Every structure is written in C-alpha cells, then in structure tokens.
Ligand SMILES: O=C(O)c1ccnc(C(=O)O)c1
C-alpha cells in the first residue's frame with residue numbers, strides 16, 4: 294500500500310509512509326482520542342493516514358507532534374489543523390519552522406521535484422520543555438542536536454518503544470542540517486537515561502528494530 298498502519302504493541306502503532314523517501318511515523322490510540330507522532334509528508338499523506346486511523350477507532354485525532362521542523366515530520370500540518378487536531382512541538386522546532394520552512398521545502402523539492410510547494414503551517418501548541426501526552430504514556434524529550442538542531446525523541450513507557458524520528462534509522466541518510474560531531478553525544482545522552490527499551494522505531498528504512506539501532510546509527514555517524 295502507499296501507507297500502512299500496523300500495531301507494534303497494544304495502543305502503539307507504526308505508520309509506514311511510502312510516499313517520496315519512505316518515512317515512518319507513529320500513532321497512539323488513547324482512551325479519549327488519538328495522538329499522531331509525526332505529521333507525515335503532505336496534507337495528502339496525512340489524509341491517507343487519517344483514513345487508516347478511522348478503520349481502527351472512532352475517537353477524535355486530538356493532536357499531532359512535529360518531532361522536528363522538516364517536511365517529513367510537519368508536511369501534513371495543514372490537514373491536521375483542518376480537522377481540529379492540535380499541532381504540537383517544542384518552541385525550538387516552532388521557531389526553526391517559522392524561519393526555515395521555505396528553505397526545507399526548497400531543499401526537499403531539489404531531490405523530489407514532485408513534492409508540493411507547501412505553505413508554512415505552524416504548531417499551535419508549543420512546549421518550552423519536555424512534555425507528555427495521553428496521561429503520561431507518550432513522552433516527548435530533547436536530548437541535544439543530531440540530524441537537525443531541534444529533533445526530539447518520543448518514548449512510550451508502557452510498551453518500552455522509542456520513536457527514533459529522523460535521528461535513528463538504518464542508513465546515514467541526509468546530513469545537510471546535521472551536527473555531525475554532536476550527533477553521537479546526543480545518542481550517548483539518550484543511552485545515559487537508561488530508558489527500558491524493547492523496540493526502536495526508525496524514522497526511515499525498515500521501522501522495526503531493537504535498542505541496538507541506537508548503537509548502529511552511532512557507529513555510522515562516527516565514521517561519517
Ligand atoms: O533522503 C532524503 O531525501 C531524506 C528525506 C527526509 N529525511 C531524511 C533523513 O535522513 O532523515 C532523508
């Protein structure tokens with residue numbers, strides 16, 4: 294399919310978005326409603342994800358988290374706003390999106406000319422720090438710069454699932470915005486938190502990994 298939505302553990306689902314360069318995002322089906330982690334590539338891909346969500350649950354999509362300011366994590370925002378979902382980010386992500394959206398769209402279109410010239414759509418729920426959703430069962434945090442300056446991790450304590458965002462993945466991927474020397478320092482700050490992790494969902498390539506995906510990418514970026 295163009296996109297799939299598949300259970301990984303309990304209420305935690307993985308989105309494989311095969312549009313453009315495959316990106317993986319996540320969905321949490323909560324008691325009051327649905328949290329989407331990563332807005333997907335475009336308003337069209339977001340609409341496709343919503344269609345999948347509505348075959349699983351009748352509960353509203355409450356919020357969508359932009360885990361960085363890039364097109365693969367925020368491109369769907371217009372759609373999510375349009376259906377009354379909150380668009381959630383850190384202040385840093387929001388600020389970088391305001392200043393740099395035009396540039397990331399342009400950059401995206403250099404490699405993907407077919408990608409739409411999307412107007413800026415900012416988060417309307419902005420956090421100054423780390424934050425949680427779903428009664429503490431979705432936990433967003435910053436552990437330093439890596440693939441971009443602002444990228445956050447999302448952790449699901451009950452299921453011991455870590456969303457890797459653009460940060461953790463199988464291949465090196467794109468380093469144009471990366472802080473290559475800080476990247477492993479950020480991964481070591483993450484590892485030092487000693488979070489119980491059974492599963493890491495890579496934001497690109499094949500999603501399903503164990504905690505060793507952290508070590509995998511760390512070794513790669515240290516050779517870059
Ligand atoms: O290869 C790309 O165009 C691409 C697009 C979005 N994200 C990444 C990444 O490495 O995170 C790479």
Ligand SMILES: [Zn+2]
Nearest residue numbers: 365459496497
């Ligand atoms: Zn990415």
